[PDB]
Design a protein around this nucleic acid. Structure first.
Ligand code: CL
Ligand code: CL
Ligand code: CL
Ligand code: CL
Ligand code: MN
Ligand code: MN
Ligand code: MN
Ligand code: MN
Ligand code: MN
Ligand code: MN
Ligand code: MN
Ligand code: MN
Ligand code: MN
Ligand code: MN
Ligand code: MN
Ligand code: MN
Ligand code: MN
Ligand code: MN
Ligand code: MN
Ligand code: MN
Ligand code: MN
Ligand code: MN
Ligand code: MN
Ligand code: MN
Ligand code: MN
Ligand code: MN
Ligand code: MN
Ligand code: MN
Ligand code: MN
Ligand code: MN
Ligand code: MN
Ligand code: MN
Ligand code: MN
Ligand code: MN
Ligand code: MN
Ligand code: MN
Ligand code: MN
Lengths: 97, 79, 94, 105, 103, 95, 86, 99
DNA sequence: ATCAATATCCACCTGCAGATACTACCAAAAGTGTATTTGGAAACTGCTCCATCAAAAGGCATGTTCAGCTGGATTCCAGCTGAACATGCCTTTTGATGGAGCAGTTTCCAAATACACTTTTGGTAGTATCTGCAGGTGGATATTGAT
DNA sequence: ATCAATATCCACCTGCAGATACTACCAAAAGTGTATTTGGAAACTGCTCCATCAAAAGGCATGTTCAGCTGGAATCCAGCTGAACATGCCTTTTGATGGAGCAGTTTCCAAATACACTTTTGGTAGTATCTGCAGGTGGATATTGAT
C-alpha cells in the first residue's frame, strides 16, 4: 500500500491551513464552552450570534500566534516537536504567567 | 465535559496554521487550559460591560470592548 | 506656581497603618505617581463606560464598574466595598 | 462647615478628586458620588501598599520606607504585582531570585 | 462643504463634531479636524491600495478580509501600526520555519 | 424610528474608487476598514488630548494632531501623513 | 564657544557594567558575543524613548528635555515610570 | 598554592549581591554621554535636566535587567547556563519587539 | 533511473448569496451670519538650574594568564507520535416558532450646573533643629575547596 | 573529616543628608445657599433576532496498528569564559560661575464659542437586478516514495 512518510502530510496541512481563513474549531462545541464559562459570572445570559463569533475569532487568532511562538521555543531547544514547556516558556516571556 | 469539546483534531489544525509540524501528546491538555484562561478573562470583562448596561444579552460590542481593554483589539464586529 | 500632590494624604494613611514608620521623599514621590496613575486609569475606564452607554454623566456606578474592570480579584472586592460604604455614608449627611 | 471627605469618613481629598475629574474631561457631567467613591478607592489602595511596604521596611530593620520597600511590597503581592505589571519603580531593584539549575552540586 | 475646501473625501464636519463630543479638549481649533480627516484619508488609501493589489494578485476584483490581512502584514510599517490588532477572518501569512522542510 | 448609526463606509468607498476604480469590497471587509478608521481616530485624538493637557492648553489645534501623528505613526507613514495633513490645511485656509 | 564631538559613546556601556546587569537579572554565565548584542539592544531602546521625549520637548517649544518629557515618552511606550513626577 | 574559588562560585555571589541592592549598575557620566550623543543626532542644541537623564537610566537599567531574566530562561530552556545572542533574540521575538 | 499513487493546478461552468441600483422620507448634520467671549501669543524679565571648568584621588575598567567544566558534536535506540482506516457519533443546516428582551418613545423629578459670597487650607518660603541610617571598624562565624 | 583562606555577619559608632518643626502669607480651593436646567430612570411596547426542536446527512472525530525517525541519554574534548592580579585612568565629588532659557505677570487680537435660521445629507427602507466567485468536473502533470 501507498504510505506517505511521517511529516509529509503535516507540511501539507500547514500549507493548507496557512492559506485559508475559516475557523478551525467546530462552532457548537465552542459556543457551549463559552456559555458555561459565562454562566459562572452571571446566570441566564443570552449571547448575540456575532458576540460568540467575535470570541471564536479572537481565541483562534490568540492560539495561532501562541503556537507560532511555541514553535520558535521548541526550535530554540533544537527540537521540531512542541511540548508544554514550550507553551509555558512563550507565555512566561510574553508576561502572561 | 465542555472544554473537552475542543478536540485534538481542531487543536492540531490551529497549531498547523501556526506552522507547527510535530505535536506532543501533552500539548492537547495544555492548550485547553490556556484557552480556558483566555476565555475567562475576556468573558469576565464582557459580562461586566453587560451587567453595567443592565442587559441580559452579551453583545458583540461587549466582547470587542473587553478585547480592547485586554490589549487584543479586534476588527470586524463593530470596532 | 503651586503644584499639588497627594503627599499629606498619603502621610495620614501611613500614620494610620504604621504610626511609627516614616517615608523617604523618593518613596513619597513613587506614591504620588502611583495614586495619579490609578486615578487616570479608573477615570479613563469610567469615561469609556459612559460613552459606550451614551451617558454624559460619570457616576459612582461608572467608577464601580471601572474598578471591577481594572483591579484584580480581591483588590476589587475590597476597593468596591470601601467605595460604596463611603458613598452611603456621604449621602446620609446634611 | 465640614469637608466632603469627613462627611464620607475619608482621609483623601474629595474636593480635589471631584475637581480633577472635571478638568480631565472624562464626561460632560460628574455626579456627586463619583469623587467620593474614587477618593475611597485611592485611599484604600494607598493603605494596602503602605501596609505591605511598612512591613518590608520592618523586616529589613528600618523605620523609614524607601523605594526598595515599595518594590518588595508590590512584587511579593500577587495582585499588586499584576496591577503594576507594566510599571517600573525607580530605585526598587528586583526580587532575590536564582533559577535552580544554576545552583552548585 | 469643508471637505471640498480641503480637497478631501473624508467628512471634515463629522470629524470636527466627533472631536468635541469626545471631550478631547475644552476647545477644538478649525484646522484640527482638517488635518485629522486628511490623515485618516491617507491611511485609508494606503491600505486599500495594498489590499487592492493583494486581491489582484489572487485574481479577484473584490477586497475581502484576507486581502486586508496580507496588505497589512506584508508591509513593515502598517504591520507595526497594527501589531496589537486582529483582523477577523484574515488568517496568517504563509510561513514555515526552514528546519521543518523536507530532507 | 431606528436610531441612525454613523460609519465611514461611504467615505471609505469613495477613496477606494480613486486608488482602484475597478475593485470592490465586501461588507465584512468594509466593517474592518471602519474599525480601522475609528481606532486611528481615537489613538490620535487621545495623544492630542494628552499633549494639550501636558502643556496646560485647552485647545486642540493642528499642531497637536501633527505631533500626535509623529508619535503614533512609524517613520515613513508619519512623514506622508504629516505631508497630507499640512497640504489639506493650507488648501483649506486659502479658500 | 563650541563643544566637543560626541562619538562611540555606546562603548561607555562597558563589559563589567553589562555583566552586573546580567547578574541582577539572575545570569550566571555570559557568552563573549553578549556584550555587543546588549549595546545594540540598549541603543535601540534609547533611540525610541529619546525620540519621543524630544518630540514632546519640541512640541512645547523648549530646548531642554525635562524629566516629564521622558516620563511621558516611557508611558506611551508602555513602560510607565514612577519616581520622577507625573 | 593560592586560593581560587571555582568557576561559577563568584558569579553566584554576584547575583545575590546585585539582586539585594538597588543602585544603578552603569557608570553615570558615561551613560549621560550616550544619551547626549543619541539625542544630538535627532535634534541639535538640546539641554537635559539632570533628572531627565536619571529617569532614562533607571528605565534603561530596568529594561535590560528584565530582558536578561527572560534571556536566562531562554538559555535554560535550551539546557544551557550560558546566555547567548540567540537567547536575547528569542526573548525579543516572543515579547513582540522583533520580527 | 523507473514506475505507480496521490496530490495539485488550470480552464470552463453555474447557482446564488451578497453587492448594486433607484426612489422615497426626514431627523440630524452642516453651513452661513452675527455677536460676545477668550485662550494664549507677544513682551518683558525674574531667577532657576544647566553646562563648564578645576582639582584631587581612589574605585573600578583594562588586558593578561591559566585551566575548569560547559557547549557542541557523535552515536544510539527506545518509544512516542504521524499516517491510514474502519466506525458511527454528533455537528451542521434550516425552517419554523415562540417570545425574551433590546431598543425607541414620552414623562417628569432628583440631581447637576451656574453664580455669588465667605471661609479655609495646602503649597511656598525663610530659618532652625533633630535623626535614621550609610559607611567604616573589628572581631566572630559560616562557606568553600584542597587534601 | 581536617583545616585553611575568605567571604559574611553583625554589634558599635559617627557624621550628615534628609526629614521634621514653626511661623507667615495667600491665591486657589472648598463649602454654603439659591435658582434653573435636564439627564436618564421608569413604564410601555413594537419587533428584532435568540433559544429550541426537529431530523436527516455524512462530515469528521475516535480508537487502532504499525513503524519511521525524533528526542534524550551517554561520552568525549577543545577552547571559551570565569577567577584573580597588576596598573593606572577616568569617573565621582566638591565648588564656583556665567547666563541660557524656563517660567511668571500683563496686554491685547485673531479665533473659538454661542445662537438663529436655512439647506443639505447620510441612513434607513422597499423593491427589483446584477454579478464575482465558491464549489464542482475533467484532464493534465507535479510530487512522493517504493524498487
Ligand atoms: Cl513539557
Ligand atoms: Cl454619583
Ligand atoms: Cl487649528
Ligand atoms: Cl547565538
Ligand atoms: Mn552625532
Ligand atoms: Mn509514472
Ligand atoms: Mn497543469
Ligand atoms: Mn487544463
Ligand atoms: Mn486670558
Ligand atoms: Mn573619590
Ligand atoms: Mn588601564
Ligand atoms: Mn584543558
Ligand atoms: Mn554538557
Ligand atoms: Mn534512550
Ligand atoms: Mn489511501
Ligand atoms: Mn417583553
Ligand atoms: Mn431601554
Ligand atoms: Mn495649613
Ligand atoms: Mn551598614
Ligand atoms: Mn573587618
Ligand atoms: Mn561579635
Ligand atoms: Mn552621613
Ligand atoms: Mn524648631
Ligand atoms: Mn430630557
Ligand atoms: Mn414614569
Ligand atoms: Mn469508535
Ligand atoms: Mn523500532
Ligand atoms: Mn536527534
Ligand atoms: Mn524517550
Ligand atoms: Mn568548542
Ligand atoms: Mn585573593
Ligand atoms: Mn535670556
Ligand atoms: Mn502686548
Ligand atoms: Mn442622499
Ligand atoms: Mn430595479
Ligand atoms: Mn474554485
Ligand atoms: Mn479530475
Amino acid at each position: 500500500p501507498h504510505r506517505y512518510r511521517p511529516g509529509t502530510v503535516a507540511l501539507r496541512e500547514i500549507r493548507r491551513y496557512q492559506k485559508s481563513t475559516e475557523l478551525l474549531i467546530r462552532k457548537l462545541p465552542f459556543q457551549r464552552l463559552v456559555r458555561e464559562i459565562a454562566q459562572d459570572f452571571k446566570t441566564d445570559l443570552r449571547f448575540q450570534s456575532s458576540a460568540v463569533m467575535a470570541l471564536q475569532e479572537a481565541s483562534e487568532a490568540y492560539l495561532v500566534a501562541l503556537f507560532e511562538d511555541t514553535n520558535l521555543a521548541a526550535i530554540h531547544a533544537k527540537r521540531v516537536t512542541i511540548m508544554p514547556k514550550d507553551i509555558q516558556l512563550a507565555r512566561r516571556i510574553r508576561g502572561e504567567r | 465535559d465542555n472544554i473537552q469539546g475542543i478536540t485534538k483534531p481542531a487543536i492540531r489544525r490551529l497549531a498547523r496554521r501556526g506552522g507547527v509540524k510535530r505535536i506532543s501528546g501533552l500539548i492537547y491538555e495544555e492548550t485547553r487550559g490556556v484557552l480556558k484562561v483566555f476565555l475567562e478573562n475576556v468573558i469576565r470583562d464582557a459580562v461586566t460591560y453587560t451587567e453595567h448596561a443592565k442587559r441580559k444579552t452579551v453583545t458583540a460590542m461587549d466582547v470587542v470592548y473587553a478585547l480592547k481593554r485586554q490589549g487584543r483589539t479586534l476588527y470586524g464586529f463593530g470596532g | 506656581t503651586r503644584k499639588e500632590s497627594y503627599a499629606i494624604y498619603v502621610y495620614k494613611v501611613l500614620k494610620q497603618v504604621h504610626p511609627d514608620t516614616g517615608i523617604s521623599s523618593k518613596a513619597m514621590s513613587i506614591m504620588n505617581s502611583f495614586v495619579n496613575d490609578v486615578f487616570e486609569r479608573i477615570a479613563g475606564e469610567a469615561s469609556r463606560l459612559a460613552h459606550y452607554n451614551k451617558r454624559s454623566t460619570i457616576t459612582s456606578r461608572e467608577i464601580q464598574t471601572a474598578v471591577r474592570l481594572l483591579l484584580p480579584g480581591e483588590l476589587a472586592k475590597h476597593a468596591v466595598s470601601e467605595g460604596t460604604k463611603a458613598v452611603t455614608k456621604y449621602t446620609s449627611a446634611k | 462647615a465640614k469637608t466632603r471627605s469627613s462627611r464620607a469618613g475619608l482621609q483623601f481629598p474629595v474636593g480635589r478628586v471631584h475637581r480633577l475629574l472635571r478638568k480631565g474631561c472624562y464626561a460632560e457631567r460628574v455626579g456627586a458620588g463619583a469623587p467620593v467613591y474614587l477618593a475611597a478607592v485611592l485611599e484604600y489602595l494607598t493603605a494596602e501598599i503602605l501596609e505591605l511596604a511598612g512591613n518590608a521596611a520592618r523586616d529589613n530593620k528600618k523605620t523609614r520606607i524607601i523605594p526598595r520597600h515599595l518594590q518588595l511590597a508590590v512584587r511579593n503581592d500577587e495582585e499588586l504585582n499584576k496591577l503594576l505589571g507594566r510599571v517600573t519603580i525607580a530605585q526598587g531593584g528586583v526580587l532575590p531570585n536564582i533559577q535552580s539549575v544554576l545552583l552548585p552540586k
